[PDB]
Amino acid sequence: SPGIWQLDCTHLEGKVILVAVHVASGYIEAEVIPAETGQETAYFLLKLAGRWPVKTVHTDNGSNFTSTTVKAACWWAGIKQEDGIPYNPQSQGVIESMNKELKKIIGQVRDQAEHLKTAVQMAVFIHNHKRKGYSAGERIVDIIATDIQ
């Protein structure tokens, strides 16, 4: 549970926003890329896994699941790559609602930066610090610390 992340890819302004969600906490990391390739996905996972103890990633589609670049990066970083199949049918909705919520925050901050990437990082900040009582950022830290002990 403390090690499980879901990949999610969403679109805005003709660009792609790649998101990793820590499932148990709702904490997120995100980046803007011109399009989702195996190489961009591989690099984003490498970044993520040097920052958090990533044990399992539920990939966002079959092309990243198949990608030899993604597989090489998951091997390198000690990540088990799984499918993102929502056997739990409530997962489709949780991700859709997160995408909708992130896009709302981005629109709330959009005018405070020229570049999309900046507004996306502002939205990451607001999402992770929002108390819901603990924030997503407090929850992930608590979950992993508990796991270390």
Q: What does the binding site for ligand OM2 look like in residue numbers (CB under 6 A)?
A: 39, 42-43, 69, 72-73, 76, 112-115, 117-118
Q: Which is nearer to a second copy, 67 or 128 (CB)?
A: 128
DSSP letters for the chain = -TTEEEEEEEEETTEEEEEEEETTTTEEEEEEESS--HHHHHHHHHHHHHHS---EEE-SSHHHHH-HHHHHHHHHHT-EEE----SSTTHHHHHHHHHHHHHHHHHHHGGG-SSHHHHHHHHHHHHHH-B---BHHHHHHHHHHHHH-
Query: Residue 85: which of a second copy, Cl ion, ligand OM2, none does it interact with, CB under 5 to 8 A by kind?
Result: none
Q: Which residues bind a second copy (CB under 8 A)?
A: 29, 43, 46-47, 49-53, 76-77, 112, 117-118, 121-122, 124-129, 134, 137-138, 141-142, 144-146, 148-149
For a second copy, the closer CB: 71 or 86:
71
Within positions 9 to 28, which residues make up the interface with Cl ion, using CB under 5 A?
none
Nearer of residues 35 and 72 to Cl ion, judged by Cβ: 72
Window 67 to 106, contacts with Cl ion (CB under 5 A)? 73, 76
